[PDB]
Amino acid sequence: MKLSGVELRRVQMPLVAPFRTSFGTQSVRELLLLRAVTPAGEGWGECVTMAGPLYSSEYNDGAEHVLRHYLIPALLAAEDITAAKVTPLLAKFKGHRMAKGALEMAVLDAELRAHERSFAAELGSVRDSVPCGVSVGIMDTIPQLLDVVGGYLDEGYVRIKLKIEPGWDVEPVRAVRERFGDDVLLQVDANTAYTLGDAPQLARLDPFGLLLIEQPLEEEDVLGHAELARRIQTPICLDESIVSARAAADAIKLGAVQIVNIKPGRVGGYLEARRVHDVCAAHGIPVWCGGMIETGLGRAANVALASLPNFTLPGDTSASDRFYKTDITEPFVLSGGHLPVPTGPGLGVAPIPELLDEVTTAKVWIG
Amino acid sequence: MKLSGVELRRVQMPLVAPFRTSFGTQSVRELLLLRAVTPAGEGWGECVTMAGPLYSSEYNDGAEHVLRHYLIPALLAAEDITAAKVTPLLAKFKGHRMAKGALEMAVLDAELRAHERSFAAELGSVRDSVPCGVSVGIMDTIPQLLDVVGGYLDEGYVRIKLKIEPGWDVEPVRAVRERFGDDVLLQVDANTAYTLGDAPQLARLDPFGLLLIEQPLEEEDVLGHAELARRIQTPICLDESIVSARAAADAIKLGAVQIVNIKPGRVGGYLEARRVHDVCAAHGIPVWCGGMIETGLGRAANVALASLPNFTLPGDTSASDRFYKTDITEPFVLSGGHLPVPTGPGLGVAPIPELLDEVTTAKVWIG
Amino acid sequence: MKLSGVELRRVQMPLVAPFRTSFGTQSVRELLLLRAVTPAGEGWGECVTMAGPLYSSEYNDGAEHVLRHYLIPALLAAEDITAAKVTPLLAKFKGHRMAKGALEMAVLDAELRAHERSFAAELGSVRDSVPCGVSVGIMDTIPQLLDVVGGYLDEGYVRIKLKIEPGWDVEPVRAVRERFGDDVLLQVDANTAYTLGDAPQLARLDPFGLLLIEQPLEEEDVLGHAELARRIQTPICLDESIVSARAAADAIKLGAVQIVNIKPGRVGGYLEARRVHDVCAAHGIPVWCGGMIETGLGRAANVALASLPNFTLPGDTSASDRFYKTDITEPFVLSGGHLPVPTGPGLGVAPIPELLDEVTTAKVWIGS
Amino acid sequence: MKLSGVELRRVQMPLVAPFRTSFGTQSVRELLLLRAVTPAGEGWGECVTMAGPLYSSEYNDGAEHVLRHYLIPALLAAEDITAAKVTPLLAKFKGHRMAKGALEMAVLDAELRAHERSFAAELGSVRDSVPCGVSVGIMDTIPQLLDVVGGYLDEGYVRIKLKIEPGWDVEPVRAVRERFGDDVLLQVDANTAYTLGDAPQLARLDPFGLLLIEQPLEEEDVLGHAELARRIQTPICLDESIVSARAAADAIKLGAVQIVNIKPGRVGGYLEARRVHDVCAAHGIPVWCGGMIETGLGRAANVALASLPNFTLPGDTSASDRFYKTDITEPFVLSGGHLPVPTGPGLGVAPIPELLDEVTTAKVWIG
Ligand SMILES: O=C(O)CCC(=O)N[C@@H](C(=O)O)c1ccccc1
Ligand SMILES: O=C(O)CCC(=O)N[C@@H](C(=O)O)c1ccccc1
Ligand SMILES: O=C(O)CCC(=O)N[C@@H](C(=O)O)c1ccccc1
Ligand SMILES: O=C(O)CCC(=O)N[C@@H](C(=O)O)c1ccccc1
Ligand SMILES: O=C(O)CCC(=O)N[C@@H](C(=O)O)c1ccccc1
Ligand SMILES: O=C(O)CCC(=O)N[C@@H](C(=O)O)c1ccccc1
């Protein structure tokens, strides 16, 4: 293809209900969407950054600026463009994985739509639906939590993931296990809230049989997780630390992880995400798909990715309505705790202009 | 996709000159070809087995049999078929990687052709041509060899690989280094010729400065290799032992390999091959594409594969004329020592029937 | 004590000569400076980012935005501020080490001035002057390289570092060793230009007796460096990878590094920089001070830093004029191949108003 | 600054109640104080030695002697003295850390006061008050023990530390736990009283959930600690062994310690103490401030030190009265289980002459 230009768009989508992690509470979702334009057709990409750099150093304004000033321009300069070529084309620019992932996604959507191929096909999907878990936030009360959990449980959600923080760990856990039982698929997510010195507190979770504890320590603390792994029973799962397939291999070699959460944007794109998957598989490390409160746009692509062979645990691929009353694309609906893998070319989804325009705050053309 | 049937051909190409390995001399290459027939169109597969079981336990007739009786039927019995799904579908059958790979290859070719996608595209190529080296055999003499080598050098080949075996090691090497120089990309191939106890002998080449020594010991002797890596200077490269991406991870993790030779059929297909590439890449292990003296069909796929990012060493992607007087597809022509990546859909190449029929020794339709 | 605000200023300074590294060629320096205002007085910080994210993910516009919209506001919202408290106060924001380091730098300078203490004193200096090396970029020709190097050597620089990259490694090294001898302190810097697959080429540098080879591989590839180290004789030195004292400890443990290049901005500030020095020291790992073509402001803080006990190798603390014809503060002049550690309060230096104003491209006041 | 001279003063302070450890019983505290004099003003240093070489090889008379004849003389001989320079200036003298630490302290107090800077600012304090534990000696009776423990807990101490010794370990612990509950922060200290062979005995404490076991083995036995760590669940904490930042690094590397007690004099100074803290922090090793029964002078410096970021466990920084009915400075008074970090320049405290005079035994001036 020849890249004609990219339309960058800001979107704000209110949450159905505040979402609280160890890094804060969220009531609305500010996101960056990209529309790639080829003489041929368009492709959509979604950025996973939030407003401020709270999960990672990347943020909405930042991603926009880099895409705008550096990444888009570099691609426009390239004679012939391929989703695979994006990487090499943007290599001179250090970091900015989410931004890069979003652009590559857009490019890929367009490229595939053109070959009349689905994300699923390109990625190597082996199934037509995927089991979905849900990410439950930090509550104000336990009872509050319990209703919530129970709720999702009825919706048909397959696995329950609890955001934890110091002062919101063992109890909430103890509570769900007690009330909900021992056969619920249960795991926690610290979003880097702890330190090695908190091992004992976390060891206190040993007894509840969680599938895993996600990113207990800071992003950069790989060896620390390996140490931690040696002090707790709960399996370590890394998210933030997994910025690439190499990052994955290193962590695995170091004993710092047993399960990996794959978030495509975090790693710089769905192509790299695929690499992550294969690398983990090759080491006997199960993976699962992480979520960044995406629109049906990222949701679609993620569902496709989650259908890969090593995605052996339910991922954070909930239905549209878990967050949004109204999605910009046709909604994702939970059918028996699963989601259907899209069938059209590219993402298999596209925004409903009407809806999109309704949530668009800014727009800019880059050619 | 829906598999209509497979047609199996036996073909017999007459080698320009006999090619002597650590397992036996070669005058005519007997190959097994596959024509997968679908709704839409067809695809071609190429088996890398040989007449009999000397590089591996797989051979032309066993391959035919397994395919005919186990593999093909399994796919035929499927509803939707994708090259990715091939693996899962055949998983109950233990081993037979070359056979599976060939089958997968035929399917993929047909799938890509249907999406108007090239192999290269699908595989994530980023380069348009690839540097080619040549595999030099066991000579009966020195000058003989020194001549050939010198010969290949002339035509544009960028790297020289030298078949070795007890009694054909250090000397031959000594001679070429001597005669042709030191700034020549040179490396050897023992085809399991040695043993740990042979270490001291293989230590003998330290001096020369070879890019690597390939498969010095048995397929199964990984530890031996790592040990061996310990007792020599020349970087270990594995071929035979690398039967999969997991195999690679393991060998790497054990320090048994520094560079990996990728042979798509040996690992079960281009898809697994791509993963081997990705695995190696995540561990900083350079890869190069291994050759099985194929037609323009395996050659085209190899070339595409060889154009991936981590193929940082020239492959056994020698021109059509290196082995074959008359290929059954447009031939491959060196040019600046490179081979151009095929731009057409699927393999981007197809057999010229007369040519093909001239060589066919048998066929079978399987429906 | 309590932050009054911070002035963000953009500055553009022409290099006396274009500087080329594996990531490109620079003919001008675009910097971000900070003037922090406190009741006790003002302090100056210098950010080490460049125009685009080529050495790292951080860049001028990015740093300015984050400072402006997150970091400054956060310090302004505090009741009390100390350079030390800067880190915890800004910890909720991931990364942006360069930006944070510049901000902590400005606070620390104001703070130190208020106590009439110099950065050197604060950091634990033990020496009054420091041996200086020079960082030489990639040339068009060798002869060209040979001259430049010859000139520096003449100026009295104690060590030569050569920027390298694929296609500009062994030769240039050979050439210089050839021409200037084996007694000269010589080292190279790839700025991540290589990969593990390149070991053999790198192993070719073995014979030159280099002090070290700096950041051959990518920033995130620590294990590869440990592996590389096993493959080559030249000592590995890391720059880009060392983003903190913990990063240094980890690389050290993993045997990925033998010598550490310390860059205050890269690690998030002078305070963290001291910690890295200390951690290295505790592990028997020598350190040296890196440079980012700073104005006299960062140069001064660097000189102070580089006077610390474990900085046992000449650093990238060249005289002002190696890059700038006209520096914005009193210039740093080499004497006997050394630079004197500054003696006044804070940085011990300050910009000359007219000089600064002349290179200033933009300025903004960030107050509550 | 230039050092004019130093006044070395012997002081003896009676304890509110005798203090028994594995190396003995303390009824009266014999200290050494330093009053540094510089052209500008003075600074006070406190040495942690005791009368005899029972905790370490250093003792009051030895300290005074080395200071008089070697240390002080070396500082007087320098033209420019800075706290930082004390080290390099005293480097030729092997050992004598506590004595060097005392001198550094006095110099640093003068130096900081000159700049009107507190020890806390200099050290890098992040907090204004610190949570306090208390060290409880060996009792004759368990009941005597519970009484004492309940008293301290009643005063608001945040943590209980018990001196243990063969014949006084499990029982004492079992009892406090029984009596006071599982929620109390409880740890123990052997002051090197056991041997590797005593492992089964120590393992007997595992059930009790102690925070740590402090210095179970002899000072020089690092490897032994590493081994012991293997046989017991209680986390190992080192005191005696940690004579410096490098020692901490080494011990950490050898797996001999999980938590480090930092004692400024032990390591040769508050400056070195800061380095230890930093080294530990970089390795994820929590630290806490150790106590030596100091006067308000050392108490003051310790409280400032303990307010550093990686002091994430309560230290042996009890209220003045825990030992002394009448301290020589303004007293430290426990508040909400905490002590406030001093705000003045240097120590932020000074001796009350009148008081100081009463407890002074000897005094000399070194000029
Ligand atoms: O289900 C989802 O899409 C969100 C699940 C989730 O926990 N996402 C968290 C995360 O830290 O992983 C998140 C959301 C948005 C932005 C950053 C982080
Ligand atoms: O096919 C080529 O271009 C080179 C041939 C080659 O060296 N491969 C050899 C091998 O043993 O690796 C081979 C050829 C044919 C069959 C088996 C093996
Ligand atoms: O801060 C401002 O008010 C203007 C500067 C600004 O917007 N910086 C932007 C930009 O869009 O130009 C930016 C740069 C880098 C990162 C994020 C945003
Ligand atoms: O400042 C100096 O004296 C030499 C500067 C130097 O070599 N720094 C390079 C580097 O990669 O280390 C640099 C300068 C500016 C910005 C980034 C990097
Ligand atoms: O032993 C004696 O009583 C006479 C010598 C003596 O006091 N030794 C002193 C000293 O003060 O000179 C001393 C030396 C070494 C250690 C402690 C004290
Ligand atoms: O709280 C305090 O100040 C004393 C705590 C303590 O146990 N100190 C002991 C020790 O073994 O650490 C001690 C006191 C005085 C002298 C030596 C050792």
Curated annotation (Swiss-Prot), chain C:
Belongs to the mandelate racemase/muconate lactonizing enzyme family. MenC type 2 subfamily. Binds 1 divalent metal cation per subunit. Enhanced by the addition of divalent metal ions such as Co(2+), Mn(2+) and Fe(2+). Optimum pH is 7.5. Changing residue 23 to A: 2100-fold decrease in OSBS catalytic efficiency and 180-fold decrease in NSAR catalytic efficiency. Changing residue 20 to E: 32-fold decrease in OSBS catalytic efficiency and 8-fold decrease in NSAR catalytic efficiency. Mg(2+) binds at residues 189, 214, 239. It comes from Amycolatopsis sp. Its EC number is 5.1.1.-, 4.2.1.113. It catalyses: N-acetyl-D-methionine = N-acetyl-L-methionine; (1R,6R)-6-hydroxy-2-succinyl-cyclohexa-2,4-diene-1-carboxylate = 2-succinylbenzoate + H2O. Inhibited by EDTA and sulfhydryl reagents such as p-chloromercuribenzoic acid. Both OSBS and NAAAR activities are inhibited competitively by salicylhydroxamate. The gene is Aaar. InterPro entries: Enolase-like_C_sf (IPR036849), Enolase-like_N (IPR029017), Enolase_C-like (IPR029065), Mandelate_racemase_C (IPR013342), Mandelate_racemase_N_dom (IPR013341), OSBS/NAAAR (IPR010197). The active site is at residues 163, 263. The active-site cavity can accommodate both the hydrophobic substrate for the OSBS reaction and the substrates for the racemase activity. Accommodation of the components of the N-acyl linkage appears to be the reason that this enzyme is capable of a racemization reaction on these substrates, whereas the orthologous OSBS from E.coli lacks this functionality. One of its GO terms (biological process) is menaquinone biosynthetic process. This is N-succinylamino acid racemase. Optimum temperature is 50 degrees Celsius. Stable at 55 degrees Celsius for 30 minutes.
